[PDB]
Amino acid sequence: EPLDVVATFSIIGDFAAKVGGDRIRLNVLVGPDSDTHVYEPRPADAIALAGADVVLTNGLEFEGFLTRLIAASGTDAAVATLTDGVETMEEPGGGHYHYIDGKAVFHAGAHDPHAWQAVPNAKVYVQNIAAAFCAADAEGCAAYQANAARYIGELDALDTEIRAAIAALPQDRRTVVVAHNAFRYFEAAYGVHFLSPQGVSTESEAAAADVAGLIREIRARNASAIFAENISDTRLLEQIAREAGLPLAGTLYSDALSGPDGPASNYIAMMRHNAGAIAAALAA
């Protein structure tokens, strides 16, 4: 019978649907245009995990509710951390932390969790999906591994596509500003710097003491355009676009897919909506 699979949010939900095919029954907890940083599960989510065979998660404390939800669900499921094997980036500030015991240990934690904004990282996510499906359903492993290997092929072409478009840009204009500091893996991969009022997580609200400072950094970096994000309320970025004298060029997709009929209804559509929107604005 089909593998009962729950993914914590929409993007890895797309990775799951792509590897699992018709062999799985997906149930995503955090939906399109929704924010996992501040998500807080409904009793249905405990029921889903208790009824699940595999739980797919991002790890690095993206899902702050995860450990409490597993406990309330009493689930027996294999929990996959799709970050395993990704070469992960430190949070900014401060920056972030070590602390020696007998020796020096990378502290708590932070690790920037947005590893998916770099397509080579998304391949590791997909690797880790199939391994988690092979583990719970030996009979389908050859199918899982063949879907993942095919999708990883399309991911590789997406990467070539993205780097090629950013390389064609004048290097003097590589700075944009978004809602929260969610695109640092995009920068490490492809070379667009990102400014934002909010930090790595959206839990803390953006204060007025950030705007004058951010406006100054936007000028010193000659940032080219301001984007809203699909998971945040756009009003503060319109204000910043005004005071900075910069166009509000559109909406980027950070931590969630769009709905269907939307422009980022799957990951590969998502990365190309962003790369093209970023590309067009910097060329202007």
Q: Which is nearer to Zn ion, 201 or 224 (CB)?
A: 201
Distance (Å, whole) CA 193 – CA 176:
6
Sole window of 63-71, 96-104, 178-186, 275-283 interacting with Zn ion (rule: CB under 5 A): 178-186
Distance (Å, whole) CA 130 – CA 132:
5
Q: Which residue is nearest to Zn ion (CB)?
A: 182
Provide the H-helix boundaries in 168-200: 184-190
- Give the residue, chosen from 197, 255, 257, 268, that forms a contact with Zn ion under the rule CB under 5 A: 255
The kind and range of the H/E element at 17 are helix 10-20
Assigned token pair, 269: 């559509």
Sole window of 88-96, 142-150, 180-188, 273-281 interacting with Zn ion (rule: CB under 5 A): 180-188
Provide, rounded to whole angstroms, the least separation between the CB of residue 60 and Zn ion.
Answer: 11
Site string for Zn ion, 215-234 (x = CB under 5 A): --------------------
Query: Quick check: 53 binds Zn ion (CB under 5 A)?
Result: no
Q: Which is nearer to Zn ion, 41 or 113 (CB)?
A: 113
Residue that the structure tokens 């009929």 belong to: 261
**Side by side, which strands form the sheet with 193-195?**
193-195, 175-177, 226-229, 248-252
Q: Is 43 helix (H, G, I), strand (E, B) or coil?
A: helix
Q: Which is nearer to Zn ion, 76 or 203 (CB)?
A: 203
**Among 266, 279, 275, CA closest to 26:** 266
Provide, rounded to whole angstroms, the least separation between the CB of residue 38 and Zn ion.
Answer: 10
Query: Quick check: 112 binds Zn ion (CB under 5 A)?
Result: no
- Give the residue, chosen from 19, 29, 182, 257, that forms a contact with Zn ion under the rule CB under 5 A: 182
Q: Which residues pair with 175 in a beta bridge?
A: 193
Q: Summarize the annotated binding site for Zn(2+) as residue ranges.
A: 37, 114, 180, 255
Q: How many helices (H) does the chain have, and how many strands (E)? A: 9, 8
Query: Quick check: 155 binds Zn ion (CB under 5 A)?
Result: no
- The site for Zn ion (CB under 5 A) is made up of 182, 255
